[PDB]
Amino acid sequence: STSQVRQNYHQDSEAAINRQINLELYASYVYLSMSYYFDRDDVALKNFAKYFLHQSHEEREHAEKLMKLQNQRGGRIFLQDIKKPDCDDWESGLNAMECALHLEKNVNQSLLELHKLATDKNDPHLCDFIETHYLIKELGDHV
Amino acid sequence: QNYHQDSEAAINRQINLELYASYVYLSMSYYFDRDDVALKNFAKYFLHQSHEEREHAEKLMKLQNQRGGRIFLQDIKKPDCDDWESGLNAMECALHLEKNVNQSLLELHKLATDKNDPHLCDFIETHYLIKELGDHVTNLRKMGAPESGLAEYLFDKHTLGD
Amino acid sequence: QNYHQDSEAAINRQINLELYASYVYLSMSYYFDRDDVALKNFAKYFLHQSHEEREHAEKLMKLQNQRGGRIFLQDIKKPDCDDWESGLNAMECALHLEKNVNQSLLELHKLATDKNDPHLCDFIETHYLIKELGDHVTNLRKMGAPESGLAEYLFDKHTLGD
Amino acid sequence: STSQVRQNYHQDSEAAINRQINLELYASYVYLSMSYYFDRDDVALKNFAKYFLHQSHEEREHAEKLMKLQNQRGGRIFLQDIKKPDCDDWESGLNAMECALHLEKNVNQSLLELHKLATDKNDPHLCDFIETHYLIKELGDHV
Amino acid sequence: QNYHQDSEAAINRQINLELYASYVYLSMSYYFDRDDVALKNFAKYFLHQSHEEREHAEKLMKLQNQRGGRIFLQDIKKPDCDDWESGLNAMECALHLEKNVNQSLLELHKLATDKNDPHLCDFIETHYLIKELGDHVTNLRKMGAPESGLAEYLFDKHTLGD
């Protein structure tokens, strides 16, 4: 049945949170793979390796913030497999960039979708959360 | 527009609710001060929170005046009971109360839809308080409260000391 | 020599295992974050260890590239269960898991026989973790876990606080 | 006929450059509109207004770099209308963010497409150019 | 009062006109960048002015919001031609364009009659630009432009260098 702390928390969102959790975990895994792509002698770009190892950790940090929110609102966390990343051709280093481009847009979009859902269901708490979480993603790199 | 008088009332309603909660936690605190109860950190916990709720209410009054509204004060009702029976009970009631106060608080937001969004910060705070009280209820239960006086003793020390 | 492709695979295998353990302890942690469990130091303990296992995996990836191998990533399987039932259970599972991970890790060493002996330090570390989890299981049991919620409460404080 | 400076410059690219020119000009115009959205008293976020006015100018700066490249290689510049931006609902300030999200991805993607084209046509000069131009777009905000 | 919507439109109209001019001078500049033209100071001159016109337009947008109006953006039309044939031509067109833009700009003032008189400074600036372009046309003509490529060469250096 229902957790004692649950208020105004729709079950659709509980499910969408869980979806975004796995997605950020996926994004973490992808960045991680991208990092060690640039680490190999065949490539040997230490700057990029530095960057994506940082991006990987931030995504996982973002994932755990979602998890903390779930338990906070009363929802329940169901973890799924973290799929090995599907971007194949890293021969050019630009295809790797293209991978991240689609990954970012996807991750950011689901957040936006998660926000419309939050607005539909009249949950102000969840709306404030996503906005922050989102602006941090896009605008965290600046100030 | 009924909006201005709808909100000015929803504010006045929320003001009396936060004052109510203030009174409630005030009662709870001194329940743990009495010598047949004698849990000092339960007492501290609620007196602190009682002051939190009072601060919230004063902020809402400053808001009303900021927005040009008029403050209509209502009586502050004595809380349901003066004997709270146990720490787990008092936590359980507070869990209930915060959820009910959060209810109207939410109603307050959906009706406003400000550019200013002033009270959203206190709305974020209530959700922390809720998760905490649930956390606290959960722990007292698994420890054997209310019937085990030891459990509440060790909780007063180990959880509510730090 | 199959050796280079045998090791490059044993590495790729160990990488996915450490990532797996990372996922496992991550799940365990937030199990203790939920309000029907509410053990903060159990949660901290596993989140820390989850990060340890992730660090281990990244090191193994840097090794693979150092040795000229190729990293073949595999899916990270969801852990066996999402409800760990109790602190003693979660410790017991982790004890099992570290022993299984240590198994292949050992296989990894006997197959290498390097001059460099790189991973021997992390091999030494797993044996500390094993003795610790055993120590932790042992203590929760003698205290009356899982069925005594008090035991796990006092363990969360006195053992996992310091 | 042919400009005296033209070498290894395919006509497909000449056309794709011209397409990306108008696109960055469009992106400039969009950011410009987004800026003064946050400038109005109804909204009044000076930080965001500051940011998009900066992003607008950078996009136009990017456009002119493409123009300078065209003339450099021998191609010819054909300007098209800069379409007024089509994102309608700015009531939420998150829909404005969503606008930029799609705009960035679009702009960045055409660059990537322009790079594949450059690789197909064996133009190393144009490949180096886009890569830089692209990394500047994505990774300029950091270092 | 149609006044508020008359002005808010006259502003929106002027905004698109200054953006148009910005586009025009932008086109003119890179016309002189191409290798079959190759006049660098003609190119500089117009790119600068193109930025001037853009600055003007952004100022008008800040005005609209200041006055509580709403900004209605319209497409920015490609300029009449992409090949400007000569420096004297491009000057001649710009002379025409500034006079036309000045026309509506004037209309904008007579309709406002502010106490604030905000745009009067940019109105004073256009009249300088007009006298300058006329000065520039005049000089290229007496030198033998467009047909004399030398004239435009020496003008690009001696007039548009300093």
Added chain:
Amino acid sequence: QNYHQDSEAAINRQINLELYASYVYLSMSYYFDRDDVALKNFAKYFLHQSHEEREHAEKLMKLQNQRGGRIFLQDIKKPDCDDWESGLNAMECALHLEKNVNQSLLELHKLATDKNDPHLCDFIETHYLIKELGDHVTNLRKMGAPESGLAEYLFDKHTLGD
């Protein structure tokens, strides 16, 4: 793999080409030094560029040795003519020559496909030189060169002075 001997030859080929261009611009320069020509800034311009091309060639030799190749030197052919007739001609020839040298240079890149991508910087530089010479041809033509000695005089001063 023919690759190593294909590239080592494409390098040796490019080396002789850059040396050739060096010789060419060297000839052009002192053509403008002679007293029946007497354009000092044309002379400076080409002597500078002649040194640029020589620098390029030495860099390519350092590359060959870096990559383990062997440098096979060939004769440096006298340039096509010793009398360049005019500044516009000499610019026109140089435009042709850089385009031809750029041709093989491109061939050099598509055949390499390095991780190191060493010569890409000099490839970027040739494209600037090409646009410049075109710019220079264009300007001399519109001024009335070659037949107008004044045009080339004023170009030597105003364009090739600064």
